[PDB]
């Protein structure tokens, strides 16, 4: 399996910026979940920051 | 509903809709008249079919009501004619919108799980569920009672 | 664990492919299939050998023979090469 | 996604209740019009190949400056074929999900499929904005171009097409 | 309107290759120096 | 056809097909001759139809029929019309089967590589369809035309 | 915060082009109706009290959240609430007035959920309140300008859900 | 515009709006129709307005046009005449809208910032929108030109 | 990942020391409770849905969230919680075993109240859950086992506010 | 906040060592270009508005940024980029003075990239914009002090990135 | 330690502790008081183990200390038995670990690209741990030698 | 991922010129150092695993972070170390015969600095680390060839602070 990057495959406009973050070594050191909660986001009014 | 995920069919396939997704969102919408009648039909019968419902229910399911059931006693009685007036109002919502998307996301995915951790009996609730679809299709012609039966068995077949 | 803990219809993790292998399984079996891919001509993907033959294991075997036919593919040959038949105890 | 009926309905059980007569008129408007959806989505299925080409020239004959080099800023409009060939592949997608958010009846498919990111992605690509919005509503008044003599159509298309522009655009105000 | 936002990294994407170009990008994408033959590879190019 | 698109997309799920699915299947077999008596009468007008197809694709694209243009000389404009033949045959299939797959499984999926590797211009041949259906509205009243109408318009999408 | 001229301003300014046929076309439709927001704001900001009196009457006032222990049992916790309710039914004028529903979101939506989670705010409940005030204030505007105050009532339902 | 700000206002105050507010919201809402008059006189006029307006502002400033001034040669004088054409565009949003709040957030907060950072003297273009008034004013009648005038010279104001 | 004897060797490890008397002192102390701790775990994995079934009965049955609107009101949100309260359960359990609660921050605690704030998830409720599922585990283990358990609880509690 | 010598007494105090021949090895070498700097940070503090004149219009003057919809339309928003490049002009001028950019993550690169994603600002025109401000300011100071200015640009277009 | 990947193997099983699980860790804990005496023996004997062990360690491999080898001198010779103190104190903490998972993420998991990396014969290394390991066994009885001389044979193996 | 050549042809390019006579001026600069670069990359390839055994053992090897508790202590963090080393090396090799950095920030430098704050590796000691493996580099390549392959380690350097 490669890692099907941006030139690679028609990429979709909904996860972007998360995929582009998947695949770099800084990965595995979003111990928090990037994905999940972006999709959830996504529905959701704004969050309070 | 028939629009919603012949949209998201078509969607996936990186593709518009075909003559046979068209002619039948085509053909669901001069449905729409028909539909509304039959579900305006359910509305207000909900004290009769919900009632009559749980009649059938106590007398085929004597144990989930006597001493140890589930629904015992004057409280659990209520929530258990409580979850027949939730399923009869989703029934309501896949005839209006021509599919079980409605009663899908709402009442049949993880039911078991619900059902199971609560200590109800899910195949007690299913026999419920099909004592009001007698009573459903009671009220209505030869025509509409295979829709509106057609319904109630598809979450019978879910729940369990 | 397993994958027959309770799950069928009307189950909060979608409806599946359910395999009956115990814990561990230890069973493998030694099929031989071809697998047409049939998207290749709208994709235009680099070219792969479609006819396989490989031990897939007793925990995964129904979900990739029902998932071979899910793509046309035809199975020539299988066979349960490592572990025992009718055996109670021991396939873990 | 959801379309208008499944929005009307998500709409009752967040209350809970049943569905009352004025949720049942807001479905009935949906069922009058929506044999009326489909010739319209039924008109882009056959000018579809056609309505790209009319909103490209339109656009071009308007901003000159996207076919031709960038300027120093790396900037991505229609300079280069490959440029040009991929450009021409959004003006399908803009196309195409507004072409189910008319059937749908709703503009629910539009953002969570076209605008989630949308800003994101260009952002990127350093892609026009400005442009990219009025290309989508050149599309509006051709599509509008075969359905004028009565006006009840004109709001059924207007509404995709003007939800992109709305949403897609730095708010000035 | 979009309620959350993923931030948009810096992509350069491709618009060629050069003789200079793809083999440092080989040797490069198996983690591995420049081999002999793909380095002499780099080298007789600036020659010409 | 329609029901092979239900069986098929229920079956990845692995459930029988919903209450929506066996409308589609319901509704579309019991539109079933009308689709049977549509065909009888496309296939009594093909020879019909591809000799005005041949009017207009050649006097619109006289480049094609030129010495030098592919279909210059007598056989290569034989099968000229055999090409037509069956892409009007291919639309009596997908006319029957109410949905796109005969006209996709073949004729669509590859065809541009299959023309580029002929040398048929492959905007030639989309206009070609699009002269098929343009010939085909003569021969055909305004009752039948729109329901074979979204069948043609299908494969210039699928040729673009 | 835009209104429905800002919006349609916006949307036509962002792609640099001039007020053509269809974003007039819009902005026609809205002053036709200017008539019947005013007089709708008019009732609303007459009858404020007597709306909210009326909300909590009808939905969540004898219900066990006003009893001992439930979600508004202290007298600071139900003042808030008849508070918390009049931002409710003022700002849901402004958008009836405004047209757009973009100053719901942008001053009552966000951080909204976020924050009666905080705090332990029964969600369920307050939705209820104001579909119930969403029905009182169709009885004092009338049918079409309550589907109007009525529309952005169920948008802070829905977002606030 | 006037609906957006006297909400705002009376959003801050914790209240809603008076009759004092509701009945100039009225009151705009029936002069809508005469400010769409007002703005279409001034849309398709902006060739003039713009060119005319550039005449008197090059006469009686001749020092930014000339060799040294900021808007020199055929490149500058372009941009000269553009940024008129920016500020007429508003006035016609401002007219619009019932106020300057189109104009306040766009091309007049921060604008001093600008065209001191572009070495633009911002008293010549003050000059510019001045020479656009006169020409503005007198293409509309006397009840008018108190409104379209009274736009530009806002404009004056927060441009110096 | 560390239980109390990894967290003794790594402290004593860390300063490139043996183990002194103070190191074996409280590894000594972990032997002790080893009994103990086994037969905590031993009647939790027993009585697993028991417990769960318990606590959401005692905390949040019938508490409006149950209701519609609330946060929990269909069925795969339901179906949810009893999955999510398994987890809290088990890890705790784990924690018991290994006596130290470096499995929960590192596998439970990291993004999760960071991600029940997305799916918009009252904390209030769901810490009152753990609070009333932790007052049933000191029924079955008894006093000092549940004493143990109870210590893991209020730490996702804790770290989960 | 450390210069070249903090850095270099940091990192031989960290060791709680004296400054041997190796930490004064670098001290006199930031020394010998003590003398460039300050006539790069001079020319600098005289040319800023000159230069920032320079960059934009030679990098993102015309773009389509520039024009209705781009990214910096309005006069706020043009005004905001004059003075936003402007800290960028003036930090790495502290850099170039303190010979070690803990300054600028400090004070600028931290929530930087974080914070033009809130507003929307496209980081891809902004880097080119410091490019070319970096292109710039090698024609002032000259090329030492250009390389000197310019190593400490592209550390925040990296960065930024 | 054998408490830490008993969880974390039936953690990944999504599954809680079998009795064959629950039963060792059972087993271990009163195994406890045993594993301590056992480590304590070897910890205030790191002075006869190690300098003994560096003893047949040049005895058996005099090129390493010879001059060229890796350890020549005063000063790679005091760091050749400072390993041989690390390798001692971790075998210390596997035997109250019950478990090399001490001994494997600490001098075992890429130890070949240290020393390796380092030019010390990686094989040397192993001989120099067989050295302590026929000292440390010659302290302890028969039931604890089975053990002791367990962990070093490990570190044996994965050295090599 | 630009060498010296794609960045002459993108900045004629971006212009949408052809390539005038200071394109060429440069490019022909460039295929003069071809030969250096070459001959540099070889003997790098050759005496990798010494270079990075000569840097570490004459930077960090003996300091305490090798020692108990310093940041390189166990086999599995030192391993990481030489294999976090190569890297650098071999980047830096990349960068010297592309003759252009921006492989190096696109494949090492973003979301470097930012992943060692999260393992709590030591930034101090890793760029000293890179100068004296950039010292090592000089020795065998020459001074000139040393004086390229050395622009680029201290761009790492100076990204990774
Ligand atoms: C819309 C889909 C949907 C369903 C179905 C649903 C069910 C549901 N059933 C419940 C309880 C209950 N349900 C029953 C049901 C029964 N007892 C019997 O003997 C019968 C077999 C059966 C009814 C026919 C009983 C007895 C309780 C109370 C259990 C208790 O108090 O422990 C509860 C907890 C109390 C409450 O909040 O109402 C929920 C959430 N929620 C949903 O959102
Ligand atoms: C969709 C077409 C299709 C079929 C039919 C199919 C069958 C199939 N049946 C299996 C096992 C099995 N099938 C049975 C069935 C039976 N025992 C009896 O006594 C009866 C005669 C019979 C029930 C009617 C049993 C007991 C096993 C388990 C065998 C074992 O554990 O060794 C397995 C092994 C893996 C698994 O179950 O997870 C497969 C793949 N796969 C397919 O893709
Ligand atoms: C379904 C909604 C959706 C959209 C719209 C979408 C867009 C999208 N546009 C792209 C590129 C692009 N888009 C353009 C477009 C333009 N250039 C101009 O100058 C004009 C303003 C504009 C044409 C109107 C260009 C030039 C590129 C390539 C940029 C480059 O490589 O230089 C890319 C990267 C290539 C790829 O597709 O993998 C994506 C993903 N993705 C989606 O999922
Ligand atoms: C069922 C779907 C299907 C199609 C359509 C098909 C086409 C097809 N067209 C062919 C040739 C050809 N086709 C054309 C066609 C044309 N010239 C024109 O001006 C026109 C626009 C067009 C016809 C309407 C010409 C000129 C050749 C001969 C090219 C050559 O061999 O020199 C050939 C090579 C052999 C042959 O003629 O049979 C195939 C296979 N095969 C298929 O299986
Ligand atoms: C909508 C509000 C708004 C305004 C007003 C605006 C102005 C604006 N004026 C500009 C330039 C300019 N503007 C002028 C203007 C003038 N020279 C003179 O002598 C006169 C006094 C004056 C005009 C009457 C000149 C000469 C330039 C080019 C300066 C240069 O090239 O350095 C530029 C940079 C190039 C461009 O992107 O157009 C902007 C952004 N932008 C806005 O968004
Ligand atoms: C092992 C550590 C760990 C935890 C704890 C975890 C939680 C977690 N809880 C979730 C949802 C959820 N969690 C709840 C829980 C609740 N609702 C209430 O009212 C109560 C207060 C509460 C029960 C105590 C609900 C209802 C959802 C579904 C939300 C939705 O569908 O939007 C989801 C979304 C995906 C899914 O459930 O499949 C995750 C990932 N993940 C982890 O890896
Ligand atoms: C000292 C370190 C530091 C920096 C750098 C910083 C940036 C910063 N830039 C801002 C906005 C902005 N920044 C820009 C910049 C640009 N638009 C473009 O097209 C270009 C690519 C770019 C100019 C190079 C614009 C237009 C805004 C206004 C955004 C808005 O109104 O929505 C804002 C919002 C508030 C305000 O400007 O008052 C902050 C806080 N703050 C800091 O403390
Ligand atoms: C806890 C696990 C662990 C181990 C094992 C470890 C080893 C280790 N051995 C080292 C050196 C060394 N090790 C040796 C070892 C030997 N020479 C020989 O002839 C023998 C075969 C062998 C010893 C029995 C020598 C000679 C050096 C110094 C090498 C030099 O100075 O170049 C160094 C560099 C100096 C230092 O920081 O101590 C480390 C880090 N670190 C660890 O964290
Ligand atoms: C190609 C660009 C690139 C780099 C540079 C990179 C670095 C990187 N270094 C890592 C760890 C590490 N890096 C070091 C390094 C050091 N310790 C010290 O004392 C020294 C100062 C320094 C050696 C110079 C150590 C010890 C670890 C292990 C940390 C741990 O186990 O917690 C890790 C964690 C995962 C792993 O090593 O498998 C990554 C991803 N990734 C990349 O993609």
């Given amino acids: 399996p490669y890692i099907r990057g941006f030139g690679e495959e028609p990429q979709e406009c909904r996860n972007w910026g998360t995929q582009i973050d998947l695949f770099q070594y800084s990965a595995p050191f979003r111990k928090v979940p990037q994905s999940i909660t972006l999709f959830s986001d996504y529905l959701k009014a704004l969050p309070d920051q | 509903s028939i629009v919603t995920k012949s949209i998201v069919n078509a969607d996936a396939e990186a593709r518009y809709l075909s003559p046979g997704e068209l002619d039948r969102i085509k053909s669901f919408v001069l449905s729409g008249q028909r539909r509304l009648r039959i579900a305006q039909t359910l509305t207000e019968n909900r004290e009769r079919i919900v009632k009559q419902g749980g009649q059938q229910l106590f007398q085929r399911r004597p144990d989930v009501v006597s001493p140890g059931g589930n629904a015992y006693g004057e409280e659990m009685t209520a929530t258990?004619?409580?979850?027949?007036?939730?399923?009869?109002?989703?029934?309501?919502?896949?005839?209006?919108?021509?599919?079980?998307?409605?009663?899908?996301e709402i009442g049949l995915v993880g039911v078991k799980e619900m059902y199971s951790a609560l200590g109800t009996p899910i195949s007690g609730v299913a026999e419920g569920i099909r004592c009001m679809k007698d009573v459903a299709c009671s009220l209505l012609s030869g025509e509409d009672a295979a829709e509106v039966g057609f319904y109630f068995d598809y979450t019978l077949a879910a729940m369990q | 664990a397993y994958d027959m803990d309770g799950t069928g219809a009307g189950s909060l993790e979608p409806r599946g492919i359910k395999?009956?292998?115990?814990?561990?399984?230890?069973?493998?079996?030694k099929v031989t299939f071809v697998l047409p891919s049939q998207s290749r001509l709208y994709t235009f993907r680099e070219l792969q050998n479609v006819y396989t033959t490989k031990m897939v294991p007793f925990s995964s075997w129904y979900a990739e023979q029902q998932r071979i036919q899910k793509m046309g593919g035809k199975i020539l040959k299988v066979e349960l090469v490592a572990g025992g038949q009718m055996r109670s105890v021991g396939n873990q | 996604m959801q379309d208008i009926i499944t929005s009307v309905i998500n709409q009752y059980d967040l209350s809970g209740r049943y569905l009352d007569i004025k949720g049942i008129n807001q479905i009935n408007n949906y069922f009058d019009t929506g044999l009326k959806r489909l010739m319209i989505a039924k008109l882009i299925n056959k000018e579809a190949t056609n309505l790209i080409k009319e909103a490209s020239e339109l656009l071009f004959i308007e901003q000159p400056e996207l076919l031709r080099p960038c300027g120093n800023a790396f900037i991505g409009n229609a300079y280069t074929t490959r440029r040009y060939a991929a450009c021409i592949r959004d003006i399908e997608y803009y196309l195409r999900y507004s072409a189910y958010s008319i059937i749908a009846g709703n503009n629910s498919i539009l953002d969570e499929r076209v605008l989630d990111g949308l800003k994101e992605t260009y952002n990127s690509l350093l892609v026009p904005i400005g442009p990219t919005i009025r290309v989508i509503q050149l599309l509006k008044e051709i599509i509008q171009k075969k359905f004028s003599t009565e006006n009840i159509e004109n709001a059924i298309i207007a509404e995709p097409f003007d939800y992109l522009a709305i949403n897609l655009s730095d708010k000035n105000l | 309107v979009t309620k959350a936002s993923g931030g948009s990294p810096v992509v350069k994407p491709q618009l060629y290759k050069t003789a200079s170009m793809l083999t440092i990008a080989q040797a490069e994408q198996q983690d591995?120096?420049?081999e002999l033959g793909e380095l002499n590879q780099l080298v007789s190019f600036l020659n010409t | 056809s329609?029901?092979?698109?239900?069986?098929?997309?229920?079956?990845?799920?692995?459930?029988?097909?919903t209450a929506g699915e066996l409308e589609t299947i319901s509704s579309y077999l019991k539109t079933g001759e009308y689709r049977i008596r549509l065909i009888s009468i496309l296939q009594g007008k093909e020879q019909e139809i591809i000799r005005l197809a041949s009017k207009k694709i050649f006097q619109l694209h006289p480049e094609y029929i030129a010495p030098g243009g592919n279909a210059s000389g007598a056989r290569q404009?034989?099968?000229?019309?055999?090409?037509?033949?069956?892409?009007?045959?291919?639309?009596?299939?997908?006319?029957?089967?109410?949905?796109?797959e005969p006209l996709?499984?073949?004729?669509?999926?590859?065809?541009?590589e299959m023309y580029n590797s002929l040398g048929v211009p492959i905007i030639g041949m989309i206009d070609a369809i699009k002269c098929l259906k343009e010939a085909t509205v003569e021969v055909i009243s305004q009752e039948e035309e729109d329901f074979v109408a979204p069948y043609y318009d299908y494969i210039i999408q699928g040729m673009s | 915060m835009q209104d429905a001229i800002t919006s349609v301003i916006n949307a036509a300014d962002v792609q640099g082009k001039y007020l053509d046929a269809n974003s007039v076309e819009k902005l026609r439709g809205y002053f036709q109706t200017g008539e019947l927001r005013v007089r709708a704001a008019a009732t609303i900001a007459a009858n404020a009290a007597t709306i909210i009196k009326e909300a909590v009457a009808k939905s969540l006032l004898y219900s066990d959240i006003t009893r001992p222990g439930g979600n508004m049992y202290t007298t600071r916790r139900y003042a808030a609430c008849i508070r918390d309710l009049d931002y409710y039914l003022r700002y849901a004028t402004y958008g009836m007035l405004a047209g757009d529903p973009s100053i719901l979101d942008e001053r009552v939506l966000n951080g909204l959920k976020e924050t009666y989670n905080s705090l332990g705010v029964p969600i369920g409940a307050t939705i209820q309140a104001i579909q119930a005030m969403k029905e009182v204030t169709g009885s004092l505007v009338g049918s079409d300008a309550g589907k109007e105050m009525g529309l952005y009532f169920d948008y802070i339902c829905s977002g606030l859900s």
């Fill in chain 5, 32 to 34: 591995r120096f420049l």
């Fill in chain 2, 80 to 104: 258990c004619l409580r979850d027949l007036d939730y399923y009869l109002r989703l029934v309501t919502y896949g005839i209006i919108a021509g599919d079980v998307t409605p009663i899908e």
């Fill in chain 6, 2 to 17: 329609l029901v092979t698109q239900v069986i098929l997309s229920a079956d990845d799920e692995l459930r029988y097909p």
């Fill in chain 6, 104 to 112: 996709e499984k073949i004729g669509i999926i590859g065809v541009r």
């Fill in chain 6, 77 to 100: 404009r034989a099968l000229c019309l055999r090409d037509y033949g069956w892409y009007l045959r291919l639309i009596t299939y997908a006319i029957l089967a109410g949905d796109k």
């Fill in chain 3, 19 to 29: 395999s009956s292998a115990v814990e561990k399984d230890s069973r493998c079996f």
